[PDB]
Design a protein around this ligand. Structure first.
Ligand SMILES: CSC[C@H]1CN(Cc2c[nH]c3c(N)ncnc23)C[C@@H]1O
Ligand SMILES: CSC[C@H]1CN(Cc2c[nH]c3c(N)ncnc23)C[C@@H]1O
Lengths: 230, 230
């Protein structure tokens, strides 16, 4: 009855999701994505990886909503940490997201702002509160904070400093803001969950390669614990 | 019978389109866009402005296809010129588009490239050939070339030089690549038509403010001449 959309960006982010749910899935191709449709604890779950970045994730989220009719979207994957207290493997949920690479400052718009929109996009307070409740019960740390999304893999101190000073972001990735944006437009509750894979600095490529699979699994496990309480 | 989606990014880009078609439209809100649905020369035309940038335009294009079932998408609006022979008011059609702000070079991917995708996205050769035919018959210049799209308003010589050297782009805007990308994914013919509003340099904000309305109208008139032959 209840339909839940579950998104990662990369195949690596959804492999553990499919395995952890442990049910059979039907594969349904649409718009260049493969949607895995299954039934788990009396809910219909629709799982897909968008492919990397803002256009990919916007498209996939829109398809989930318009073609599959999902009633909530939960994103699970990895991210770069912009703050000392978010270390490799640590989880956070996005309270707000921003498109950090948006620049219409030639017209004196604030960075991140587009006319007829807003700098910050909100996620579901109800889903974030559920995550927090579960994290406390499992004795797991969970941070809440701003996630910055853009179409670059960030791997420099200079870009980190900008994201922190301009947007007070705690983490960086390439999809969350676009997912939450679409959801907002269609009145669909959204939760963006990430596990830290790297520190978004000069060493980030190397850290990401090392920790992608473990961090993806950490995020996937937690997302499943949320779906278990929905 | 035939359904044609018509897109601009800004309200200013579709105002002349609605006026030039000169028919009644029904307004249908969806996903934060207003779709203007009318009948013109025995075709159903669905007109909308996406709002600025790649996420907005991806969403709107996806809605056009999935919710309204359009069989072709024609984009009309303004752009920054990256080449001397494209002057203010001049028209071009995009042969290919690129997301110029995509950077996964930390993993030695070429700029503009995302895994499971491609740097360049093609548009409809058939629609481009129609534009060329019409332009020749009307004795209007029409260039064909690469259009670069990103989420920044480009207003610097340094960024222009990069777009020309890296992608051999002739023009820059913030929506075309995302529109053509979605269309490709759903097998929908796409044509991206632009009229030059500025030179994407330090003076671009000022040129854009001056020429937006005239350049939008130039593009809109031409798009209508295409729809007249479809
Ligand atoms: C192969 S591209 C990176 C993929 C992993 N996703 C999140 C991410 C982790 N670290 C990041 C960083 N330093 N900068 C931006 N994004 C991220 C984004 C994209 O799907
Ligand atoms: C208010 S933002 C600019 C709007 C006009 N569209 C095209 C465009 C013209 N000149 C451009 C330039 N120098 N750099 C990028 N884009 C453009 C993009 C956006 O909708």
């Amino acid at each position: 009855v209840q339909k839940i959309g579950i998104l990662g960006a990369m195949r690596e982010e959804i492999t553990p999701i499919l395995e952890l749910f442990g049910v059979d899935f039907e594969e349904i191709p649409l718009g260049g994505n493969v949607f895995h449709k299954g039934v788990y604890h009396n809910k219909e779950i629709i799982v897909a990886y968008s492919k990397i970045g803002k256009v990919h994730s916007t498209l996939t989220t829109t398809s989930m909503i318009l073609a599959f009719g999902v009633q909530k979207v939960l994103f699970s994957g990895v991210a770069g940490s912009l703050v000392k207290d978010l270390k490799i493997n640590d989880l956070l949920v996005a309270t707000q997201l921003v498109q950090h690479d948006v620049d219409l400052s030639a017209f004196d718009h604030p960075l991140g702002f587009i006319p007829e929109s807003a700098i910050f996009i909100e996620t579901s307070g109800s889903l974030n509160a559920l995550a927090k409740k579960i994290a406390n019960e499992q004795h797991i740390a969970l941070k809440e904070g701003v996630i910055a999304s853009g179409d670059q893999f960030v791997h420099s101190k200079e870009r980190k400093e900008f994201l922190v000073s301009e947007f007070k972001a705690s983490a960086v990735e390439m999809e969350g803001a676009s997912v939450a944006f679409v959801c907002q437009k269609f009145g669909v509750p959204c939760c963006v969950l990430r596990s830290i894979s790297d520190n978004a600095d000069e060493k980030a490529g190397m850290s990401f390669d090392e920790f992608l699979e473990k961090s993806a699994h950490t995020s996937a496990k937690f997302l499943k614990s949320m779906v278990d309480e929905l």
